[model samples]
Target: VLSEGEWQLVLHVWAKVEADVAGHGQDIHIRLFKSHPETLEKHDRFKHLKTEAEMKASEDLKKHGVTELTALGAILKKKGHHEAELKPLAQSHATKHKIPIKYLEFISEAIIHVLHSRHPGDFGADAQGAMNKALELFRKDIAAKYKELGYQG
Candidate 1:
C-alpha cells in the first residue's frame, strides 16, 4: 500500500532470475518510499537502505549531476572520477525509469528482498538474469500499486 507522488521504483531482478535459474519459486518483498513525504514507515525504520554497497551507489551517483567520462580511465582517476565500480553507470540506468533518486535506498532494498526473498548477494553470472526477471515482474506491480493510490506512473 503506497501513497505515491514523489517516489522511486526499487526492484530485485537478479534474485528472481537466480531463483528461476535454480528451479525454485521464491517470494520477494518490494518497498516503496517517498522523497517528498516525511519519510513514511511504521516508525521511520525504513528511511535508509542497508548495505555499504548501496550507499556507495549513492555516493557514486552524486557525481552525475555534472561531470564527463569521455576522458580515459587514468585521466578520470587523476580528476577523482574513478569509483570502485560503475555506480554512475548503474544510476544512469536507474534514473531512466523516470523515478527520483533521493531517499531511494529503502525502496531499493525492499524491492531486492521482495524479488529474491533475500537481501542482495554476490550472485556473479546469475546477477543479470535475476535482475532482469525482477524488473520485468516489478514494473507492473509497482505501476499498478501506485496507480491505485492516485499516483501517476
Candidate 2:
C-alpha cells in the first residue's frame, strides 16, 4: 500500500530506470551474477558465460534481461493492482522454473541497487522507502503463490 507520494516516487524512479531498459536489464543480471555466482548455475542460458564480460556481450542475455525488466515494468504500471498478472507468473516460476523465493528477493535487491546507483543523488531515503515498500508488496504476492504451490525448491 503506497501512499500518494510514494506512488509518484515509484513512477519517477521507474521512469529513470525504464529510460535505459537495455542497460538496466543488463546491469541487473550482471550484478545478480556477481553477487551470487552460484545462482548462474541454475540458468542454462547464462550458465555457460563464465565471466561478466562474456555475459554482457551475449545477445540472448540482453534480450532476456530487457524482457524481464519489461515484465516488471508492466506490473509496476499497475501499481499495487497487479495480482491478476503477477499470480500467473509466480505460479510459472514455481511449477515451471522451480524458482525459489530467494531468487525473487535477490532480483528485487539488485533492482534497488541499480536504481540507487543510477541516480545516486535522487534516490534518497524517501525514495528508497517507497521502492522498498513497493517491492515488498510484490514479493508478498509472489511468495504467497510459491507457498500455495508448496514450492520448496
Candidate 3:
C-alpha cells in the first residue's frame, strides 16, 4: 500500500497525465513500441504500423490508448480497491494477449519515460519510487493472473 505522501505525489503526477490521457497514453505506447519494436508484433493492428504517422492515424491505437489509461487511472484513483479491476484486466490480457512477462519491464520503463518527460521536476526519486512500487504491484498481480490462467509463456 502507498503511504499518504506517495498517493499525493502519484495523484499529482496522474492529474497532469490524466489531463491529456490520450496523448500521454499514446506517448507511452509509442515509446514502448519504439524501444521494443518486437512488442508491436503482439498487437495485431499495430503490427502493421511501421511509422509514427501510421500509429497516429490509427483510430484503433488511439482508442485503445484512451481505454487503457482510463482503466489504469481508475485503478489509481481508488485506494484500497485495485484488485477488483486488476483481476479482470489480468484475466483478459492473460487469456487474450500473448505477452511475455519480460515486456512488462519495457512497459513500466515506457510509463516512467512518459511521466518523466511530462513532469520532470516532479518525478524525483520519491515520486519515481512511488510509481515503481505501484508498477511492481501491477506486474506481480498480472504475473500471478497469467500463471493462474496458464499463460506465463
Candidate 4:
C-alpha cells in the first residue's frame, strides 16, 4: 500500500508523463530493446524491427505501445483498484505471449529510468522510492495472475 504522500507523488509524476503516453510507451519499448535485445527477439511481431526507428515506424508497434500505455495510465488512475484490471492482462501475457515474469522487472526499471531522465527535478529520491514501490505493486498484481495459472515463466 502506498502512503498518502507516495500516492500524491506518483500521481503528480504520472500526470506529467501521461500527456504523452504514446511517446513514452514507445520509448519504454525502445529502452527495453536497447538494454535487452533478447527481449525484442521474444516478441514475434517485433523481432523483425532491428532499429529503433524501424520499431517506432512499425504501425503494429505503435498500436501496441498505445494500447499498453493506455492500460498503464488507467491502472495508475485506479490505484488500489488496479489489481482486478491487471489480472487478465497478466494471464494473457503468461498463457499466450509466454513472456518470462522477469521481463516485468526490466520494464519497470526502464520506466523509472525514462521518467527520471525525462523529468529530472520532478523525481527526487522520495519520488523515486514511491515509484519503485508502485511498480512493485504492479508487478505483484501481474505476477499473481501468472502464479494462479501455474505459469513458471
Off by over 4 Å in 4: none
Count clashes in each candidate, considering only residues at least 3 apart in sequence or on different chains: 8, 0, 0, 0
Poorly placed runs, candidate 3 (over 4 Å): none
lDDT tens digits by residue: candidate 3, 1-153: 778898778778888887899888788889999999998888877888878878877889989999988888887776535777877887777787777778887888999889999899989889998887777777777788788888863
What does candidate 1's lDDT look like per residue over 85-110, in tens digits? Answer: 33433344344433433333334444
Query: Which pairs of residues have clashing backbones in candidate 4?
Result: none
The candidate scoring highest on lDDT is 2
Pairs of colliding residues, candidate 2: none
The digit string of per-residue lDDT tens for model 2 on 38-66 reads 66877887888888789879999999899
In model 1, the runs with Cα more than 4 Å from the true position are 1-42, 45-106, 109-122
Give the TM-score comparing model 4 with the true structure, all chains together: 0.92
lDDT of 1: 0.33
Looking at model 4, residue 79 earns an lDDT score of 68
- State TM-scores per candidate: 0.25, 0.93, 0.91, 0.92
Order of models, best lDDT first: 2, 4, 3, 1
Which segments of candidate 2 are over 4 A away from where they belong?
Answer: none
Backbone steric clashes in candidate 2, count: 0
TM-score of 1: 0.25
